[PDB]
Design an enzyme around this catalytic site. Sequence first.
Site, mmCIF file in Angstrom:
data_model
loop_
_atom_site.group_PDB
_atom_site.id
_atom_site.type_symbol
_atom_site.label_atom_id
_atom_site.label_comp_id
_atom_site.label_asym_id
_atom_site.label_seq_id
_atom_site.Cartn_x
_atom_site.Cartn_y
_atom_site.Cartn_z
ATOM 1 N N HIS A 166 4.305 -1.536 -0.435
ATOM 2 C CA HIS A 166 3.059 -0.824 -0.614
ATOM 3 C C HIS A 166 2.933 -0.489 -2.088
ATOM 4 O O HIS A 166 3.924 -0.188 -2.737
ATOM 5 C CB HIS A 166 3.066 0.475 0.163
ATOM 6 C CG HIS A 166 1.688 0.996 0.319
ATOM 7 N ND1 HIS A 166 1.104 1.793 -0.637
ATOM 8 C CD2 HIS A 166 0.766 0.783 1.282
ATOM 9 C CE1 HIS A 166 -0.119 2.095 -0.255
ATOM 10 N NE2 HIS A 166 -0.345 1.483 0.934
ATOM 11 N N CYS A 201 5.818 -2.461 3.785
ATOM 12 C CA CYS A 201 5.191 -1.241 3.285
ATOM 13 C C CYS A 201 6.193 -0.373 2.521
ATOM 14 O O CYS A 201 6.508 -0.666 1.369
ATOM 15 C CB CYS A 201 4.442 -0.505 4.391
ATOM 16 S SG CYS A 201 3.176 0.676 3.837
#
Lengths: 187, 187, 187, 187, 187, 187, 92
Positions: free
Chosen positions: F125, F105
């Site tokens: 992400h 992420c």
Amino acid sequence: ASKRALVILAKGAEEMETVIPVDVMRRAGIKVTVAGLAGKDPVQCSRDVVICPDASLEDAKKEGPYDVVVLPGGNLGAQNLSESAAVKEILKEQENRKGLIAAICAGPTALLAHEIGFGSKVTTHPLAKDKMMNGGHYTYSENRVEKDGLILTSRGPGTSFEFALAIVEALNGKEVAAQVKAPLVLK
Amino acid sequence: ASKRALVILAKGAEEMETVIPVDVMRRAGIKVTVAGLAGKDPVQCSRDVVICPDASLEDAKKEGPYDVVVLPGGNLGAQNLSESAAVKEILKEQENRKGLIAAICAGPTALLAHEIGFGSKVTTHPLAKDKMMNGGHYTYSENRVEKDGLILTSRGPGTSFEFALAIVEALNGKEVAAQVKAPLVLK
Amino acid sequence: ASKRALVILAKGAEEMETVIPVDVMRRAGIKVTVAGLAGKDPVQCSRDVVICPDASLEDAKKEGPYDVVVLPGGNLGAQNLSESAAVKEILKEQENRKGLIAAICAGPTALLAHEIGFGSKVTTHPLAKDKMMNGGHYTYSENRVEKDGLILTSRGPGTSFEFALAIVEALNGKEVAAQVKAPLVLK
Amino acid sequence: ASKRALVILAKGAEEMETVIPVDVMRRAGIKVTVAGLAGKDPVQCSRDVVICPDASLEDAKKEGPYDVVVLPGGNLGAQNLSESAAVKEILKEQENRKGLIAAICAGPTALLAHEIGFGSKVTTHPLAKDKMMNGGHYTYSENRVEKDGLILTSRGPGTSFEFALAIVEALNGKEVAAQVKAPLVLK
Amino acid sequence: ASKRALVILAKGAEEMETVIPVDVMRRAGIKVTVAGLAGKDPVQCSRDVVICPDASLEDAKKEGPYDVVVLPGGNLGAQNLSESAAVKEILKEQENRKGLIAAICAGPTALLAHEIGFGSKVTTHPLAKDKMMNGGHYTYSENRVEKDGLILTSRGPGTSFEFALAIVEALNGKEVAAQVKAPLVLK
Amino acid sequence: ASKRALVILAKGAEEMETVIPVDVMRRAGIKVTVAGLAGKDPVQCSRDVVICPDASLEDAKKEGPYDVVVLPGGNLGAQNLSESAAVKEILKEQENRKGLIAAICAGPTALLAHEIGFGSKVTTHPLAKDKMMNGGHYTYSENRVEKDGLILTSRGPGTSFEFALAIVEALNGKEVAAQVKAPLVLK
Amino acid sequence: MDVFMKGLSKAKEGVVAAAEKTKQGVAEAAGKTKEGVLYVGSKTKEGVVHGVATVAEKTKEQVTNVGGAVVTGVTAVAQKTVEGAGSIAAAT
């Protein structure tokens, strides 16, 4: 001139407690209307049997009155009956006209919800005794079928035939009930 | 990993002999497919209960094999099963793979029509004995439920629960059957 | 093969329910045999119309099979059909060979007496519903004409033309029925 | 003291237009005499239904007068009535004594042949209109049943019940007709 | 005013089935209370992740009611929920007040233990089907997420996001759920 | 001798991206140490889940080296990892000993901060792409999971299971990963 | 083939297979209670000296059809007690 029965079919109804009385009553020469609580749409029952009502309760009500109003059980089925203003109206009016009301398993709990037949001796599914006896508005019975005046109750899928034949007897007399019973190969 | 049941639903089927086994089996954790003999169309039963199949038999067959094939009765229902080449294929193959075949009321007569399980001890509705025993391809039994190997038979609407619970016992064992039975309030 | 019809004529038969189907069927090009239940003797009907059968049922049976067996009504007529072993044999055999059986008014009650077409949707005269539904071996219908498979029923003198034309349609197809209907000046 | 009807039955008569009025009138408590035009011999009708008259026209005439004289139709039947001097005498005398004359289908053409009820509003089978209107001795009507004074006409097999019930009404009053009608299961 | 969720955290709870719903619900603007079944003490989960509850269930209960009660799974976790009288009370009352109950994996088995939502369509972890279907008090579903009225169930760690987002949808509506979902990078 | 994983848990870490890999890896038989970046104290995560580390990073480091170093995401979590000299040391040394580094992420951004694995194909992400690609020290990938040598990256909460199972496969082989995955009921 | 590992691989699937049996067992005979603390007119003390003495009807009539199937274990055993006889040419 045939006797007439209204069977109120709600989502989550126990399909055995629906179909057995409809079938048995039809065998007795009763004109049965299977009325969908929320319309003419097919009704998904407790064990995913999908039954097509003969009409909406709306329309069925207009063709009344009926000699019996039948409430099948099933936990959700009974909850749905319990929440319906239309059902309340029908039961109140049936009680008023001194017509038969028959409820099986969790079905009787709708009687409580709509303040029907208070003071009556009733049975229910063992599991539903608690709910039914909330407020002490009935006396409880362990009989497989219970009839106290125009309030007829029964206990579960396994008492469905007895319940249905008790309705036949109430509407059409003992001899008719016996005739219908014979080919069912009950014990 | 669920056991699986195919219930073959034909026009004119006895709806109690259809619904009771489907419901009871579903209570036992069996994955039941209600398969419409002539397609996905809603099926009008002997007493005009209209049941929507989960699929066509065509499509259901493709998702097989099943641990049990269930034949409901009803005079016309059984006639319809008896006339179907698809049903013949399914029963032959089920017998072949040593899978259970269960038939109730007039249902067993389809076994005769398709030359299934000859030499088996069978029961039927009393009315259907004549037809079933045509040719002497079975030995007849008066028991409410009869199980002879992979041929399980029963007599009528009034034996439906016993029939269904016998199937549960065959698929899932005694303990499961007893569990499922308990809340049915049978006698 | 013209299509062929056997009309079984018993003492006390309703003469309108006899004559209308014979006439209408003959208009359709059906070869009709009016067969006297107890021989070639002239038959006194319910309202004293005296009809000469074409032959005895004995002899008519020998010239079979017939595409339809027609049972007129009349209370006594139907009682007479109900008591005849010959009639039982004919209906059993007709059901067996997948031939049409058509009964009007009280006529269907002979079906019950001889255990014919159990499980079928049927209609009768309103007055005969009670008798027909004794045992719950049928599902009852309010339709003027009812056809469920090879069991065709109707209600009374006033439905005779509709009954007859339904037989024509079953045997000879829609177009023939329409042709025959046109000059009948029906409502 | 019963009202009385004479039905004149000739070879080639439409058997439905004969039997329906006889039956219906007898249901109304009318004393009906079925009189064979050429004697007491069995009469072969248009579709080979063979009816035994109660007596010869000869003998029936002697037991008169009748409250109604009924002429069934059928092309040949009507031709036979049209050619009979006895029929002429009966109709002339009935018209004279201000008694009812009722004719159905081709039946009214005999009225023309015997110069009965000229100037009357009449109906016939559509097919018979041209013959009936030959000479312009009537005004034609499309009504299923037509009553103009003591001349009552109707159109065909399909209007036979209405024709017969109109006769009942004329002889016995509306209330009786309604009583008789009820069990006929008309639409 | 925020919607509110109670997540009941027992020793042996599956930590992913706890954390995913708490996190996802918090992203949706739900006020979540993580309530330790046996107090405020840190809770050792199935894979030894140690989660500090926000408070004891005792204290959390006092701050109710909650719009949803969430039961995480894990074999031991679910056993612990199943054995708690406090949990029974909370679920009974939640069912009563028509509040949502959501259970994942083995979590639904606590519903069975406390006789919650009988007759409901439910799913569970495949492994937990047997236990859940003990008594046939539910209908079983193979869907990843199942919602039947106020009973919402799901299958396992791998369905946790779907389960959580279904709760969001139930409390906060579709649009909110979609918003929350977007940045989760689910497929 | 079991493989070993160090999961570095910082304040503001995404708790799903922490717990899912820890749990999944423990299911794979990996010895996982959850190491608190700032000591043994409980760690408040992005959505206020409070996780108690197994030890301080200080102490965990002393038990090293580990087969994988795992960096959870969360924007603040990743910022905290990015600012830690201890983290820098650990990553440098892991890269040096040719050990696996896995980041999810926002987690990969700590790689950038500490100049780890420059030239690697990475994912992050979507929101963190900008930060990660600052300086063009990586090539960016849209794959849910990316593995380029000993640099393994993934995108978000919704890819956590895939990320974790990719680590399992890297450490323990395909067969182990498959075993662990099966009961997770992934989509 | 190896004397007993034929039945020590087949038994492993009375353990793959017959697993889903007592798994139900545990899974399902634990909530007697449920309807327990409830009262049902199905037991009144003749469904004890009757409602017990009629669950013979279904349990009675297993062994007409397990006439063979608890005796087809009296089929396949003492033909190893003739891989006893031909063996005491050898064994002894």
